[PDB]
Design a protein around this ligand. Structure first.
Ligand SMILES: CC(C)CCC[C@@H](C)[C@H]1CC[C@H]2[C@@H]3CC=C4C[C@@H](OC(=O)CCC(=O)O)CC[C@]4(C)[C@H]3CC[C@]12C
Ligand SMILES: CC(C)CCC[C@@H](C)[C@H]1CC[C@H]2[C@@H]3CC=C4C[C@@H](OC(=O)CCC(=O)O)CC[C@]4(C)[C@H]3CC[C@]12C
Ligand SMILES: CC(C)CCC[C@@H](C)[C@H]1CC[C@H]2[C@@H]3CC=C4C[C@@H](OC(=O)CCC(=O)O)CC[C@]4(C)[C@H]3CC[C@]12C
Ligand SMILES: CC(C)CCC[C@@H](C)[C@H]1CC[C@H]2[C@@H]3CC=C4C[C@@H](OC(=O)CCC(=O)O)CC[C@]4(C)[C@H]3CC[C@]12C
Ligand SMILES: CC(C)CCC[C@@H](C)[C@H]1CC[C@H]2[C@@H]3CC=C4C[C@@H](OC(=O)CCC(=O)O)CC[C@]4(C)[C@H]3CC[C@]12C
Ligand SMILES: CC(C)CCC[C@@H](C)[C@H]1CC[C@H]2[C@@H]3CC=C4C[C@@H](OC(=O)CCC(=O)O)CC[C@]4(C)[C@H]3CC[C@]12C
Ligand SMILES: CC(C)CCC[C@@H](C)[C@H]1CC[C@H]2[C@@H]3CC=C4C[C@@H](OC(=O)CCC(=O)O)CC[C@]4(C)[C@H]3CC[C@]12C
Ligand SMILES: CC(C)CCC[C@@H](C)[C@H]1CC[C@H]2[C@@H]3CC=C4C[C@@H](OC(=O)CCC(=O)O)CC[C@]4(C)[C@H]3CC[C@]12C
Ligand SMILES: CC(C)CCC[C@@H](C)[C@H]1CC[C@H]2[C@@H]3CC=C4C[C@@H](OC(=O)CCC(=O)O)CC[C@]4(C)[C@H]3CC[C@]12C
Ligand SMILES: CC(C)CCC[C@@H](C)[C@H]1CC[C@H]2[C@@H]3CC=C4C[C@@H](OC(=O)CCC(=O)O)CC[C@]4(C)[C@H]3CC[C@]12C
Ligand SMILES: CC(C)CCC[C@@H](C)[C@H]1CC[C@H]2[C@@H]3CC=C4C[C@@H](OC(=O)CCC(=O)O)CC[C@]4(C)[C@H]3CC[C@]12C
Ligand SMILES: CC(C)CCC[C@@H](C)[C@H]1CC[C@H]2[C@@H]3CC=C4C[C@@H](OC(=O)CCC(=O)O)CC[C@]4(C)[C@H]3CC[C@]12C
Ligand SMILES: CC(C)CCC[C@@H](C)[C@H]1CC[C@H]2[C@@H]3CC=C4C[C@@H](OC(=O)CCC(=O)O)CC[C@]4(C)[C@H]3CC[C@]12C
Ligand SMILES: CC(C)CCC[C@@H](C)[C@H]1CC[C@H]2[C@@H]3CC=C4C[C@@H](OC(=O)CCC(=O)O)CC[C@]4(C)[C@H]3CC[C@]12C
Ligand SMILES: CC(C)CCC[C@@H](C)[C@H]1CC[C@H]2[C@@H]3CC=C4C[C@@H](OC(=O)CCC(=O)O)CC[C@]4(C)[C@H]3CC[C@]12C
Ligand SMILES: CC(C)CCC[C@@H](C)[C@H]1CC[C@H]2[C@@H]3CC=C4C[C@@H](OC(=O)CCC(=O)O)CC[C@]4(C)[C@H]3CC[C@]12C
Ligand SMILES: *[C@@H]1O[C@H](CO)[C@@H](O)[C@H](O)[C@H]1NC(C)=O
Ligand SMILES: *[C@@H]1O[C@H](CO)[C@@H](O)[C@H](O)[C@H]1NC(C)=O
Ligand SMILES: *[C@@H]1O[C@H](CO)[C@@H](O)[C@H](O)[C@H]1NC(C)=O
Ligand SMILES: *[C@@H]1O[C@H](CO)[C@@H](O)[C@H](O)[C@H]1NC(C)=O
Lengths: 299, 299
């Protein structure tokens, strides 16, 4: 402490409106305020919390699903059990990515391509292939959940139509994700400082559409089940409806979050409401798998 | 892009060794390198991941413990069930704290006390009372686990000695945590820019000691159980030993992590190895509670 300045005794002085002087690719003499630096830091601090929550939840839900399910040879169990493992691998590679030199303030303020080494683009390119494999696992899980609902001979002509509207949309989603990943990765590899390509996010709208379709099918199945269990002399649910609606056995909340996500503007948290919705869909698929496979009008 | 400088064509130029020019309390003209700024940012990015993992794990382990335990009126269940809730409340208040103005780069580089408002010290002071209540819950859980082991009349003179060495150490731990919190909070309230007081971390050594004592008691109980189940004509464990040793039914891994934590220097991750060890102890207490209460030599 050599000498304290006059600014230490000004009650109306506002730090954060001061100016940082720095050197960039456009020559020495660039300037920024402290609030833009803090806004750059707060987005990394905000997107590390979500992926830590994802890694923790999926890691502790894998063990629980092993120790609690009794029949462990069905395909639906295996697919639900590898989706959480791709969640954990995605979170691990994202943790590696966030502490490297490609998501730092140094690169952001000073856009020097000398700071990026070969390997950072490979950790940034493996993540976009883990994402496509996680989406493929979710879509195949949904298709397997649609197959088992209409196994009986009550409606053997609506089930094939629904399988044909839930199959095409899953290869549409996995194809728009592989084309977006290969088209972002050719650009990223060619030049390190380049704008990533987006297509009206025409991939999260397809994922949303698929999950909305699943919600629709399960609600329709419940409405049909009530009418089936009244014409025949059987009892009817009293407090079981609230479980099969609000307890994510119909994928209702993960299908409200995505349609509040792709409707609102980027200002109100568009990039935050999709990571939570993917986590919620992946965690809610073991619940929807128990209702879909269940018998419609059994004791 | 007005004009690109010569530094864009130097292969040997190293960004990060450049210098930031800023204004501080010691007058205008202070300087720092980009690597110290990135070192300040990386510690916040590293300590948000751990608390996100804590919030996720505890939040999804609370629901599972409710839906899976059959008897839900024992005291041990209630204490184990409120410890995870204090973990979630601690994580929530820490998430609020990390995005405020007290953990920012602006305050760090420019130590102006005008940037801190009344309320940030209250969010920084509630956290140190949630920590003391979490520690109190852990200690009372351990004392209740010690009480139930020696309920029988085989050894009615060793159990009271162990309860008297596990009770005094728990009020010692909760008292050193309340005195450290009140003594850090009087200083923090008096002046916002002040050094926090430490006492050779003489609180994490006590927590470690208590958990080590629990590990010791449970290993002793297993060794005694084998000798009890041999003299009498009863069967013996074949692959159950590895469960009761390596599967955290004896608190072994949470008691190795703390003694690798308070032994190593602060350079090798002392502040990282204690948050993981507290999470592991809190998650492993439902396992240790099933062995301790279990009958020693029953079928
Ligand atoms: C079902 C189980 C696994 C629990 C799931 C809980 C999540 C839905 C919660 C827990 C922690 C929450 C996060 C805690 C803190 C923040 C920071 C918050 O940031 C701000 O709004 C302030 C700073 C800024 O403006 O960026 C945005 C929401 C977010 C990511 C929250 C999003 C929702 C999360 C992930
Ligand atoms: C990639 C990440 C998730 C880390 C990898 C962790 C695995 C090495 C762990 C996590 C879940 C574990 C499984 C969780 C549950 C079981 C069932 C368990 O058997 C039983 O509990 C039933 C039969 C019996 O009672 O013995 C045998 C071990 C196993 C397969 C575990 C083997 C080791 C696994 C695969
Ligand atoms: C889901 C379960 C199975 C955990 C999976 C963890 C992996 C995603 C992690 C664990 C070890 C990691 C590796 C550990 C070390 C390195 C070297 C590292 O080398 C560097 O260039 C950076 C360090 C340096 O500059 O020397 C590049 C990433 C890599 C391959 C890491 C890639 C990500 C890995 C494979
Ligand atoms: C199911 C549960 C028990 C998790 C099982 C898997 C773990 C053993 C894996 C999953 C994620 C892994 C982590 C993912 C990322 C990192 C960051 C990595 O950091 C680096 O070395 C690069 C960044 C830098 O230091 O600059 C070190 C390994 C570590 C902690 C990995 C250690 C091993 C972890 C915890
Ligand atoms: C857990 C199961 C599903 C296997 C998945 C493991 C992957 C997460 C690992 C295995 C091979 C790894 C890759 C092996 C080699 C490299 C090159 C490596 O190049 C470097 O810059 C570091 C080494 C060097 O300096 O040459 C960067 C990481 C990368 C892409 C690794 C990224 C992480 C990968 C894909
Ligand atoms: C709305 C926000 C504030 C979250 C509230 C907490 C949820 C994460 C909890 C509260 C109710 C819970 C549900 C209540 C009951 C069940 C039935 C349970 O299945 C059974 O026990 C068998 C069927 C039966 O007992 O009827 C599976 C978990 C689930 C869906 C629970 C999942 C987790 C839920 C949604
Ligand atoms: C099944 C259980 C776990 C569901 C719990 C309810 C969630 C769906 C809610 C509870 C908290 C909510 C968050 C609370 C605060 C915010 C900040 C909010 O921020 C803004 O509006 C502007 C700031 C910005 O995002 O940049 C955006 C929505 C979000 C992430 C909310 C998203 C929806 C969340 C995660
Ligand atoms: C979006 C929110 C609701 C997610 C919250 C976390 C879920 C992924 C967890 C928390 C509660 C768990 C449930 C708690 C209790 C049960 C009952 C359990 O039933 C049995 O053990 C049946 C055994 C037999 O078949 O005889 C099967 C797992 C299940 C549905 C669990 C599945 C995983 C759940 C839904
Ligand atoms: C039992 C269930 C709930 C799984 C628990 C997993 C944790 C034990 C793992 C998951 C994520 C891990 C973290 C992922 C990344 C990092 C960064 C890693 O690298 C550095 O920070 C290096 C130094 C630096 O660059 O600052 C240090 C370990 C740490 C905090 C890991 C610590 C161990 C964590 C919390
Ligand atoms: C902020 C953090 C602490 C999360 C708080 C979420 C609560 C609103 C949730 C989490 C666990 C839930 C409980 C989990 C299990 C049950 C048992 C459940 O019992 C049943 O009738 C169904 C299962 C059975 O038959 O045993 C009734 C709801 C209840 C108390 C749930 C009520 C709502 C709770 C407390
Ligand atoms: C763990 C579960 C059971 C409960 C978690 C609840 C918390 C996440 C909430 C409850 C009360 C909330 C606080 C209520 C009021 C405020 C004051 C609010 O505004 C101010 O600080 C004053 C105005 C100003 O900023 O000038 C900032 C958020 C904060 C600390 C809130 C932060 C989030 C808190 C701690
Ligand atoms: C039902 C179970 C899964 C528990 C769910 C808990 C959530 C409802 C809580 C826990 C942590 C909370 C978060 C903790 C901290 C923050 C930062 C806080 O930041 C601010 O913007 C503060 C106000 C301001 O300064 O403007 C906004 C609310 C938020 C995201 C909270 C939103 C509500 C959350 C996600
Ligand atoms: C869920 C059950 C266990 C109850 C726990 C509720 C907490 C989440 C609440 C109760 C008291 C609250 C605190 C009461 C008072 C304050 C002071 C307040 O400071 C102000 O800026 C207020 C005005 C001033 O004093 O200048 C900031 C929020 C805080 C710490 C509150 C944070 C949220 C707390 C801890
Ligand atoms: C990161 C690497 C080192 C893998 C870590 C894997 C652990 C997180 C797993 C592997 C073995 C698991 C244990 C295997 C068996 C049991 C017994 C189980 O209790 C029973 O006796 C029930 C058995 C059943 O229901 O089939 C409780 C969970 C526990 C301790 C498991 C807890 C989680 C453990 C330690
Ligand atoms: C019982 C099951 C849940 C497995 C638990 C595994 C953990 C006990 C391991 C796995 C990953 C380990 C971490 C991997 C990497 C690091 C970075 C390492 O960093 C250094 O040595 C120097 C850099 C720094 O100061 O951070 C310190 C230990 C730590 C946190 C390790 C601590 C011990 C961890 C959390
Ligand atoms: C990294 C280590 C510390 C494990 C972290 C996760 C634990 C907190 C979870 C994972 C597996 C869970 C166990 C999985 C299965 C069981 C058997 C279950 O047995 C019953 O009484 C119900 C019937 C049955 O499922 O067999 C009781 C809960 C318990 C011990 C669970 C307690 C909580 C455990 C240990
Ligand atoms: C930062 O940039 C401006 C140029 O507009 C200059 O006036 C100022 O002297 C520089 N340095 C400081 C410490 O303010
Ligand atoms: C900084 O900028 C001025 C003009 O842009 C230039 O003359 C000078 O060489 C640069 N470097 C230093 C160290 O002043
Ligand atoms: C930053 O501080 C040093 C003082 O040692 C000065 O030489 C330099 O001109 C300042 N500004 C820049 C842009 O380098
Ligand atoms: C910056 O520092 C010098 C000497 O320390 C001082 O004369 C000057 O008033 C300060 N402010 C500006 C804007 O140059």
């Amino acid at each position: 402490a050599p000498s304290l300045s006059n600014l230490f005794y000004d009650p109306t002085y506002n730090p954060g409106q001061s100016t940082i002087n720095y050197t960039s690719i456009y020559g020495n003499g660039s300037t920024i305020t402290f609030d833009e630096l803090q806004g750059l830091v707060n987005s990394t601090v905000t997107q590390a919390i979500m992926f830590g929550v994802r890694c923790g939840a999926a890691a502790l839900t894998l063990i629980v699903m092993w120790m609690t399910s009794r029949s462990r040879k069905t395909p639906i169990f295996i697919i639900n059990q590898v989706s959480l493992f791709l969640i954990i691998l995605h979170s691990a590679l994202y943790f590696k990515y966030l502490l490297s030199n490609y998501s730092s303030v140094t690169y952001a303020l000073t856009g020097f391509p000398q700071f990026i080494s070969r390997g950072d683009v490979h950790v940034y390119g493996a993540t976009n292939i883990i994402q496509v494999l996680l989406v493929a696992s979710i879509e195949t899980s949904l298709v397997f959940q649609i197959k088992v609902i209409f196994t009986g001979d009550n409606f053997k002509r609506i089930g094939l139509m629904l399988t044909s509207i839930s199959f095409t949309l899953g290869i549409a989603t996995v194809t728009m994700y592989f084309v977006s990943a290969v088209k972002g990765m050719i650009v990223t590899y060619n030049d390190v400082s380049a704008t990533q390509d987006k297509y009206f996010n025409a991939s999260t709208i397809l994922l949303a559409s698929s999950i909305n379709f699943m919600s629709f099918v399960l609600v329709v199945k419940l409405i049909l089940a009530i009418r089936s269990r009244r014409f025949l002399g059987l009892k009817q649910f009293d407090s079981f409806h609230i479980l099969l609606i609000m307890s994510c056995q119909s994928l209702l909340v993960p299908s409200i979050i995505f349609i509040l996500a792709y409707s609102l503007k980027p200002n109100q948290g568009t990039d935050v409401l999709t990571t939570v919705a993917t986590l919620l869909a992946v965690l809610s698929l073991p619940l929807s798998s128990m209702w879909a496979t269940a018998a419609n009008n059994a004791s």
